[PDB]
Structure formats: C-alpha cells, structure tokens
Curated annotation (Swiss-Prot):
Name of the protein this chain belongs to: Sarcoplasmic/endoplasmic reticulum calcium ATPase 1
Source domain of life: Eukaryota
TM segment ranges: 49-69, 90-110, 254-273, 296-313, 758-777, 788-808, 829-851, 898-917, 931-949, 965-985
Active site (UniProt): D351
Gene: ATP2A1
Organism from which the protein derives: Oryctolagus cuniculus
Positions annotated to bind Mg(2+): D351, T353, D703
Length: 994
C-alpha cells in the first residue's frame, strides 16, 4: 500500500477491505502475512563468516587434489590392460564427491541459519492493533502485524510500522521522528491526504513512520507498509556493514583450528615420505614421479578426511537452538555472544522482592485447638500451599490433604479471616494474574478462605474473575458485617460486629470477630474454642498457644503470626460509642480464642531449589535488598542462601556497615558476602568491582536506571521484564517473569550449549584421529594398503558432514550442574579428554587394520588366507617360500579394502552414538534421544550399502559386496567401540570429577 500518504483514508481501508471498526480478520492476517511476510527486517547482508582457517585450507586441498587426478591418468593413460576403469573414472569420482561434500556442507549451513530465524521472536514493539475476533485492543508482537490491520497509539508508544493515520483521538497529536528526520522538535500529524506522491517524509504530515514514537496524543491508523517496505526499513537495509570483536571461545577455537591444520598438515606430509619405498614399484605404472602423485593424492586426501568440517555452522546451531530453548523458559537472550559467558557465571547478584520472593503475602500455616480435657492440650496444625494471591493451593495436615470443612474449628477461623478484613482479590484479565485490593497482610487472609473453601462451594467451573471472591462471598451471605472497630496501636488489633444476614431480629446470633497480634489478643481471651465447644482459658492452654506462636515466629520460616478470636456475647450496639479507639480495646474483651494463622512472603516458584542448584554448581548467590540486616539475614535462611542454623555474622552487611569498612575490608566482604541490606544505589557497582577483583564472572540483576551502571559493569546484566527500557538495553539478558529461578536455568542451558559443542568436537576428532591411525598403522607395520583416494573422500562424506550436523540437534545433557563454572582460563580440551580421544581413535584405526587382517589372515570360512607374512606381501612373486593356493594378485583383492572401509563407516556411526552426551550412558540417554541422528546415520548407512551392492558402483570404489557373515563381522568389529567409550564415560562419571 505504498504512497498511502497521497490517498484518502477510504482509499486505504478499501485497498485492504478492512472495517476500521473491527480491523482485520484471522484469514486476512494469514493472507496479508504470506503476501508481505512478518514485520521484520532480514539478514540478507553479510554479518557472519566461517571463523576457522582450515575451512579455506581444505577447499584448496580438494581443488589441488583434483589436479593430481587430472595429471595422474593423463601423464600415462595407457597401461598394459589399457584402462581398468577403476583408475580412469577417478577424476569423475572425486569431482562427483566434492559435489556431495558441497550439497552436504550447505545442508548444515542452512539449519545453522534456519535456527537463527527461530530466534526472531524477542523484545519487539508489541504494537497495539484491532482485529475481528475481539472488540478490545490486542497487545500483539510487532512482527505479527501485517500491512492493512488497524493500529492505535497513545502517549509514549513506539510506531511499529508505516501507518496512514485514520483517526486522531486526542485534541492533537505530536510525534518524535527525530531518528529519521532532521526534526528535533515533535511535529504534528493530520488525518487528510498529502496528494503529491513524491513528497518527502517531512511533508507526509499524515503518516507515522516505523521506529518513531509519539510525543503526545492517541490515534488510530492503518498500516500502509511493514518490514523492509518501511521508510526506516529502506534505510537500515541500505546501511554500512557492521564489524565485531571476538569471544574468548572463538579465540580459543581459532587457536584450535590452528593446532589441527598444522598437525594434520604434518601427519599427511609425513605419509608422502613413509611411502617413498613405493613410488617406483609396478602397481603405479612402474615409474617414479607417477607414484609420487599417487601417495600425494592419499595424503592430500587423508587430510580432507581428517579436517573436522561443520564446527562453525554446528555451534551456531547449538547456540541458536539453545537460545530458543532458554526463551521458552523466559530467558530472553539479547546477545548471542554472551550466552557463551553465561556458563561461566560464578556469582549471581539478585534482588529479593519480586525476583527471589513473590512479594505477595501468603498464609502457609495455621492451627486451632484439638483436645484439652486432661489439662494438656494438643492442636490441629495445618499447612497451606500456593504462594501468591491466586485461589490456587490446598490445605494440608501432616503433609496430607483434607477438606477444610471437615474441621468445624476451621469454619470459624475462615469466618473470621473472611469477615475481619477490608481487602479483596481482583482478577486483572488484562495481565491474566490475580491482584490484591488493599493491604497484603489482609488480602493474604482472603486468599486463605478461597484455598480453604470450608463450605465446598463449586469453583472449578467458575471464571477467574469469578473464583476471585467466591468462597469469601458465601461467608458474607451467611454473616452480615454491621460495623467495624478500626485498628489502633494500643491494642494492636481490630474486629467487626456481625449477625446472621437477612435475620429480621436483634440480640440473636450477634458476634464480634477479632483479629490481632497474639499476646494482647490471647490475654483478652477467657474462653478457648475447641471443637464447636468452648472451655475457659486455663493457665496451661494459654501456654501451648504461645509455644507454637514461638516455634513459628522464630523458626527457619520466621512466619508473621495473627491471632483469631471471637467475642461470643458482645455488648449491644446501643451501649457502644464508635468514635475513639480508646474504648475499642475494652469492647474487645472476654474473647474466645479461635485460632492462629502464620504468614510470610514466600520464595518464588523453584527459587528455593534453584539456589540449591547454584550451590551444587559452585555459583555464589548474593541477595541484595532493602530489608534490615536481621530480617534480611532471615529471608536468606528461609530461601537457602544460609542454613537454618549456619553462622553468618560476617556474610551479611548493610550499606552503612559496608561504607564503614576500609577498602581492604570491603573487597574481602565481597569474596564471602551472601546478603546485603539497605544498600545505596552506588553499592551494586562497587560490589561488582570487588567481585571482578577475584576474577569472578558475575550476573547482576537490575531494574532501573539506578542500576544501569552496575548492569553494564557486570559480566552479565540481567533486566527484569517488568523493568525500565533503559535497564533492558543495559543487560545482556531479560527475565520475562523476573524470577530468579530463571537465571539459574539460563545459566544451566549455557552449560549444555557448551557441552553440545564438546560432543560435536569429540566425535570428529576422536573418529578422524582413528582414520589417520589406520592409514598410518598399515604404512607402519607394513601391510597391503587399506584405502585409496576416493575411499577417503567417501568416508569423509559419510561420517563427517551429515551424522556430524546431527549432533547439533542433541538435547540438554544431565548432571551438568555439579561441576564448577567454566573458567576462560582452562583449555578447550582437557588432557583426559585428549586421552579419551586417542583412546577411541586409536581403537577405530585398529579395528579397521584389523578387519582386513581378518580377511587376509585366517577367517572362519574366508575366501582367501595367508599368514602374518602378509607384511612382506609386496615381495611376493612366487618366490617359493610363503606360497600356497595364493597368487600375488590376491593382495590387490577388493574385499579386504571393502571389509575395511565398511568397518570404518560402521564403527564411526557406532561412535557418533557416543556423542549424544559427554559423560552419560546410552542407557541413561538412548540413541533415539536425538532422532535426526538415527536418521542421518541410516541415510548414510544406506549410501554405503548402495555403493556395495549396486553393481555399476562397487567397481569404481574397488569394493566387493560382503555377505551377511561378512557384515555380521563388521558389526562385532565396530560395535565394541560403544562398549569402550561407555567405560571412559563410566570412569569420568565417578572417578575423575567425583
Ligand atoms: Ca477524511
Ligand atoms: Ca573431515
Ligand atoms: Ca579479570
Ligand atoms: Ca569421519
Ligand atoms: Cl482524507
Ligand atoms: K557487560
């Protein structure tokens, strides 16, 4: 809908056939969506490259390798047996392979950039729009907005796309389009056209350019364009290409792609030397330089086979797929390069309120009397679940569920909780969460009655707005609150005067429900309600009550307690003066203690266990807060930062105590601290500084400009999703819920996104080192060659390239949080890991130069046989010493090389199955965990059988199809790799790390 600035509002509403009263419709959305794409700008420009030097090392090798195959046959294309066809088509083979190496190398290149696209649902404009389905506004993602739908914007909003204003709801509408125009002041917009189709944006006084924000006003409009069709979109697309610095894992990995290339470049250039003894020999046209181009091919080939390809792309996938994974968990990563650091987090600094704690008061404990006949009374203690103002949760006794209604004592406790209250619950259908109305401590009660629901009302069926104050209303339908006696610090309590509702009488049923702080309320109780009874307040009982009120108010939970009682025979309203707190303490006498409830601000979901997790992963959790030292210290023993009876007289500090210490004592405080209370805004940054001094990677939560500095200085800034825009742009990550338990998970995924890479690296390296050992172990202990040029190319393609990319789809490893956080100090590969590599690779290479050895040497019923004097085979000429029913041309036999190459491939897939997780079992994580692997394995295992059995080919590959016994061998020869590595894993899993 270009040039919408020159068209009537009608011409546009028409062009989209949308009614501005109800905006678009589902199918219109999907329709326009497909025709114009999502409201985003792509990455069509170059902003990424193949970090490794070797990727450009190999591509030159496969080019020059081909050259050798064009000089090879050419120099002398005529042999005694003209052209065997298995040395004539080689040029046609390698090239047929480089093509496969390509089709594959670009297969993984896509997934790598296909996953990037998966992460395009981050922190967008969230523009507002009107669609058919609903009548009220719709806060939808900026990208989900299609040209054509109806968008409205009020003060402060950011313009999500190019909008042709339709209606201006405010007396006027100024906008700030400073970012796109030479206009510093906000300008006005109007609802009419601007005929001239080629006028400049400054003169498009009726449009709202995307990426702009309105200074003042509200106004509806219709999206002309979106995406790159946007005025700001035609700009950013046409911008200067951006460059970047590099991360310590990239550096350490580039240093790695420098070690290998070199070594490789010598493991092979050492082959064109260990095989000098065969350059002249017959098999190679019986000339020198001709063999000097055959062993060249092998080396330049062995290289290609060893060069672990795919790393850059694969990482980018784990990375991508992982971030996707984090987001599902509310961890919106803003900087990919940072997720790298994320697993090196060694200290998290979090704020208490909202993040570690819910900040919604919740009753979690309550009791009442059970028995008292024997001058020794027991009680009925109940626990309550659910830690917010939402009606969700259930009453428990001895960790077991019970109906609140079955206990008559509770029915009154609720009646009090229900009536002696001035607060309520409200469902904010907008935010889809339960809100409180008034004081929290009261509201906490409200929610208790709901979780109680002593009268088994039907709730499930009700609407959220309905479940809000359900059970609470029932009680109000049975008891009329006449008047209330306001609070007062003299008696520290309050109460109400109630009487049966609808009851058309007086002086009957009247009761006064009193609620207050324990002591005082208990001392005004002369009677104590048991069952439905009421026995006088003896000396022993009153002791029992106060005893638990202590066990509760002091214990690890440190619950705030409230005493619930009723005045059975209240004075009459007449004889009562309600205009001074002075007399109220009096009317509130001769009470019958009903029960007590204990509330507290509960720790957010999982936070209690997440802290335990950090603990297992050596991460320091430091709580920053506004509380007082004492209460703050408490909250820490409540959540776990501190054991219930752990001495922490030096790991909690308050702003002032801290400023009072000397720099050297401040730095020390931080290497041990775990709680900070009443902190000046400038302490966070100071705290981090001291944290950095002990080389500690630190994640700091913030939520206001107040934290901007601290957020930036930290290794990882983490902004509250409920925070300010400033803090969000200062952090490298955002908490959608503002929950602490997230950070811990984000951190964990970091550990997996690393471990994934390590699975990928280990599989190539361990496997390829195994190839290089076969080519070597034959040329070593002297043996009939096991592989030739095109076979190396084959193996490469079948075990690098595809089942390799697969692993990038491996899932999150386990017991990944019991190690200390990674330090950018320690090396890419640990000495034991390298062993673990050679342990494997050294084996595979054996199994291969031990599969053909089984073909040549004895074999249950083998088609050929000889003895370990096979190491001298080349001197065979029927010399009459080691001769039998054998001919010197049996050392050219195809099946051996085929019993080999087939062992290689199958052994590697058996190995790729080991790359599902660094130190776990195939038992604890089956091969089917990652499907794409099983797939890629088969898709390759197949390309192998196809080369062996499809007659026009096994000839080119100098191979010769093996039978069911010849394949049952390959299995028992390669399958035992699982067995081995499964041991190394076992070891490490218990002996090494601990
Ligand atoms: Ca008009
Ligand atoms: Ca390779
Ligand atoms: Ca440092
Ligand atoms: Ca391989
Ligand atoms: Cl108009
Ligand atoms: K930073």
């Amino acid at each position: 809908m270009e040039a919408a600035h020159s068209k009537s509002t009608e011409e546009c509403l028409a062009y989209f056939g949308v009614s501005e009263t109800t905006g678009l419709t589902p199918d219109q959305v999907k329709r326009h969506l497909e025709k114009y794409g999502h409201n985003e700008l792509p990455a069509e420009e170059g902003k990424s490259l193949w970090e490794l030097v070797i990727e450009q090392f190999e591509d030159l090798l496969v080019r020059i390798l081909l050259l050798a195959a064009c000089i090879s046959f050419v120099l002398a294309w005529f042999e005694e047996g003209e052209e065997t066809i298995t040395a004539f088509v080689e040029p046609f083979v390698i090239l047929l392979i480089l093509i496969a190496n390509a089709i594959v190398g670009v297969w993984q290149e896509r997934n790598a950039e296909n996953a990037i696209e998966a992460l395009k649902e981050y922190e967008p404009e969230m523009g507002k729009v009107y669609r058919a389905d609903r009548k009220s506004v719709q806060r939808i993602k900026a990208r989900d907005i299609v040209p054509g739908d109806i968008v409205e914007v009020a003060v402060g909003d950011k313009v999500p796309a190019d909008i042709r204003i339709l209606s201006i709801k405010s007396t006027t509408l100024r906008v700030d389009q400073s970012i796109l125009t030479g206009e510093s002041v906000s300008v006005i917009k109007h609802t009419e056209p601007v005929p001239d189709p080629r006028a400049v944006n400054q003169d498009k006084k009726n449009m709202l350019f995307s990426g702009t924000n309105i200074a003042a006003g509200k106004a509806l409009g219709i999206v002309a364009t979106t995406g790159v069709s946007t005025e700001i979109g035609k700009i950013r697309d046409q911008m200067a290409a951006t460059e970047q610095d590099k991360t310590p894992l990239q550096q350490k990995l580039d240093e790695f792609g420098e070690q290998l290339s070199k070594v490789i470049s010598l493991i092979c250039v050492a082959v064109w030397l260990i095989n000098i003894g065969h350059f002249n020999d017959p098999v190679h046209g019986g000339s020198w330089i001709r063999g000097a181009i055959y062993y060249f091919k092998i080396a330049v080939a062995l290289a290609v086979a060893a060069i672990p390809e795919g790393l850059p792309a694969v990482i980018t996938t784990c990375l991508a797929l992982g971030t996707r994974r984090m987001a599902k968990k509310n961890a919106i990563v803003r900087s990919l390069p940072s997720v790298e650091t994320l697993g090196c987090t060694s200290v998290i600094c979090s704020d208490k309120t909202g993040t570690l704690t819910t900040n919604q008061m919740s009753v979690c404990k309550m009791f009442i009397i059970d028995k008292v006949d024997g001058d020794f009374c027991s009680l009925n203690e109940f626990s309550i679940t659910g830690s917010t103002y939402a009606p969700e949760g259930e009453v428990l006794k001895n960790d077991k569920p019970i109906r609140s209604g079955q206990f008559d004592g509770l029915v009154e406790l609720a009646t009090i909780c229900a009536l002696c209250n001035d607060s309520s619950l409200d469902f904010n259908e907008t935010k889809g969460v339960y809100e409180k109305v008034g004081e929290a401590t009261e509201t906490a009660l409200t929610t208790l009655v709901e979780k109680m629901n002593v009268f088994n009302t039907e709730v499930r069926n009700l609407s959220k707005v309905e479940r809000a104050n359900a059970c609470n209303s029932v009680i109000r339908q049975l008891m009329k609150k006449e008047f209330t006696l306001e609070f007062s610090r003299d008696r520290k309590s309050m109460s109400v005067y109630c009487s049966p509702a609808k009851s058309s009488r007086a002086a009957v049923g009247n009761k006064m429900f009193v609620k207050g702080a324990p002591e005082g309320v208990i001392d005004r109780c002369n009677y104590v309600r048991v069952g439905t009874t009421r026995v006088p307040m003896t000396g022993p009982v009153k002791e029992k009550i106060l005893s638990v009120i202590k066990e509760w108010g002091t214990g690890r939970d440190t619950l705030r307690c409230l005493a619930l009682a009723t005045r059975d025979t209240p004075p009459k309203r007449e004889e009562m003066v309600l205009d001074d707190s002075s007399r109220f303490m009096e009317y509130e006498t001769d009470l019958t203690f009903v029960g007590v409830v204990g509330m507290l601000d509960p720790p957010r979901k999982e936070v209690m266990g997440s802290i335990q997790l950090c603990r297992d992963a050596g991460i320091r959790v430091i709580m920053i807060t506004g509380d007082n030292k004492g209460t703050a210290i408490a909250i820490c023993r409540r959540i776990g930062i501190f054991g219930e009876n752990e001495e922490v007289a030096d790991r909690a500090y308050t702003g002032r105590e801290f400023d009072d210490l000397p720099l050297a004592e401040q730095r020390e405080a931080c290497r041990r601290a775990c709680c900070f209370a009443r902190v000046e805004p400038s302490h966070k940054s100071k705290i981090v500084e001291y944290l950095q001094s002990y080389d500690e990677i630190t994640a700091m939560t913030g939520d206001g400009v107040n934290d901007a500095p601290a957020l930036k200085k930290a290794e990882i800034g983490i902004a509250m999703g409920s925070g300010t825009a400033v803090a969000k742009t200062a952090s490298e990550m955002v908490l959608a819920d503002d929950n602490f338990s997230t950070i811990v998970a984000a951190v964990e995924e970091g550990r997996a996104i690393y471990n994934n890479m390590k699975q990928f690296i280990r599989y190539l390296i361990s496997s390829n080192v195994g190839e290089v050992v076969c080519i070597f172990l034959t040329a070593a202990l002297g043996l009939p060659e096991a592989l030739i040029p095109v076979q190396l190319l084959w193996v490469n393609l079948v075990t690098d390239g595809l089942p390799a990319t697969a692993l990038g789809f491996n899932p999150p490893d386990l017991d990944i949080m019991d190690r200390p956080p990674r330090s950018p100090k320690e090396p890419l590969i640990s000495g034991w890991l390298f062993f673990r590599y050679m342990a494997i690779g050294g084996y595979v290479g054996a199994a291969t130069v031990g599969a053909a050895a089984w073909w040549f040497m004895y074999a249950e019923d083998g088609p050929g046989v000889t003895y370990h004097q096979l190491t001298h085979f080349m001197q065979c000429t029927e010399d009459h010493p080691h001769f039998e029913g054998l001919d010197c041309e049996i050392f050219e036999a195809p099946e051996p090389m085929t019993m080999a190459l087939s062992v290689l491939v199958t052994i590697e897939m058996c190995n790729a199955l080991n790359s599902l997780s660094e130190n776990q079992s195939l038992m604890r994580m089956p091969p089917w965990v990652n499907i794409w692997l099983l797939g890629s394995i088969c898709l390759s295992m197949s390309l192998h059988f196809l080369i062996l059995y499809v007659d026009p080919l096994p000839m080119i590959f100098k191979l010769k199809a093996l039978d069911l016994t010849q394949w049952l061998m390959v299995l028992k020869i390669s399958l035992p790799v699982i067995g081995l590595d499964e041991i190394l894993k076992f070891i490490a899993r218990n002996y090494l790390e601990g």
